[PDB]
Design a protein around this nucleic acid. Structure first.
Length: 346
RNA sequence: GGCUUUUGACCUUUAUGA
RNA sequence: UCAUAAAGGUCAAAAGCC
């Protein structure tokens, strides 16, 4: 029943029975999300003496991408505030707004609205990106974990399917590389990150789910010294774009392709021009600098300052060693014993 | 041939915030 | 119009099952 004992033919069956989200489970999470969202915009930042307001609460993480694994009762919310004027503004006052959110959550708890339990000092205080807590509500039938991140609304009103004005990227690059905070404000472009995955073929998302499951399995051996999970998601998308491009493909072949790409990480230089490009001199120069870095280079399609590769070859070494082992498992093999084969790249 | 689910798309509408 | 949840209808993709 485990993935490592599942034959290649049966990968889609494994995904269906173990990875695809459940209806009743998902409805609980969505209601929990609405409860927190309404708390933020109706209670937390709504006082008449309070100038700060919520322009939008954006659902990030896997829930925004539609790549959620079954049994995952959690949500990552980015709350964009009208007060922040810049990225540096966010970097300084984020600890302040997190304190306020926590104080209002305590107030609602005092008023017996719901029950919240905060994560105790897993990160050290200063500088935190998120407020972490578990929500318990009488309306809900299960508990839901939350990560809430206050952010400067860099995109403003952005419509999916369109390129942001590059001037926001110029602003980002200037502020980032002035204080060495490359990739620090990728959360501001959460909407771009989920948009990059939203319209992908259904089976590609299922493959992402499978890759994520494999990743988290390895994560129980190595812990947090692996590359970011987001890097594996981008790598999976890259594999499909270069080697398949079809709604219908072999799940096993896609899986082996990603594993082999992990092995060949020393030659990975991956980027997109989905939301930015070389047309703007400053932006294009930033892109070029990134492509000249030690491999693997996997540039965030939403943030030109972010190399998801991590700049840690040790993490990729540990993942490559898992990749080589898993290539000998039944999940990459036909019943006769031979490998299903990887996609032919370009 | 049929059903269901998951993930998206489109046309309206409701609530809340901007 | 954007964000979060929901209502009605239609469409698509993939998967599972009969």
């Amino acid at each position: 029943m485990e993935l490592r004992h599942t034959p290649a033919r049966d990968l889609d069956k494994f995904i269906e029975d173990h990875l695809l989200p459940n209806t009743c489970f998902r409805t609980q999470v969505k209601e929990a999300i609405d409860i927190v969202c309404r708390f933020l915009k109706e209670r937390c930042f709504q006082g008449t003496a309070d100038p700060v307001r919520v322009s939008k609460v954006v659902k990030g993480g896997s829930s925004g991408k539609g790549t959620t694994l079954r049994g995952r009762s959690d949500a990552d919310l980015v709350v964009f505030l009208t007060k922040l004027t810049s990225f540096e503004d966010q970097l300084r006052r984020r600890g302040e707004f997190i304190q306020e959110i926590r104080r209002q959550l305590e107030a609602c708890q005092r008023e017996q609205k719901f029950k919240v339990t905060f994560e105790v000092q897993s990160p050290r205080r200063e500088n935190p990106r998120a407020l972490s807590f578990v929500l318990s509500s009488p309306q809900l039938q299960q508990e839901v974990e939350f990560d809430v991140l206050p952010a400067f609304d860099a995109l403003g009103q952005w419509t999916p399917g369109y390129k942001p004005n590059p001037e926001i990227y110029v602003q980002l690059i200037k502020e980032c590389k002035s204080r060495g905070k490359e990739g620090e404000f990728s959360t501001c472009f959460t909407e771009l990150q989920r948009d990059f995955l939203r319209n992908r073929p259904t089976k590609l998302k299922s493959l992402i789910r499978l890759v994520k499951h494999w990743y988290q399995t390895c994560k129980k051996t190595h812990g947090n010294k692996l590359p970011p999970q987001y890097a594996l998601e981008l790598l999976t998308v890259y594999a499909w774009e270069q080697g398949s491009r079809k709604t219908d493909f072999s799940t096993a072949q896609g899986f082996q392709t990603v594993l082999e790409l992990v092995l060949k990480h020393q030659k990975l230089c991956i980027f997109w021009e989905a939301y930015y490009d070389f047309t703007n001199p400053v932006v294009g120069r930033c892109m070029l600098q990134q492509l000249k870095k030690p491999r693997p280079v996997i540039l965030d399609p939403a943030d030109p300052t972010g190399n998801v590769g991590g700049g840690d070859t040790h993490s990729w070494q540990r993942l490559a060693q898992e990749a080589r082992v898993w290539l000998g498992y039944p999940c990459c093999k036909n019943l006769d014993g031979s490998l299903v084969g990887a996609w032919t790249m370009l």
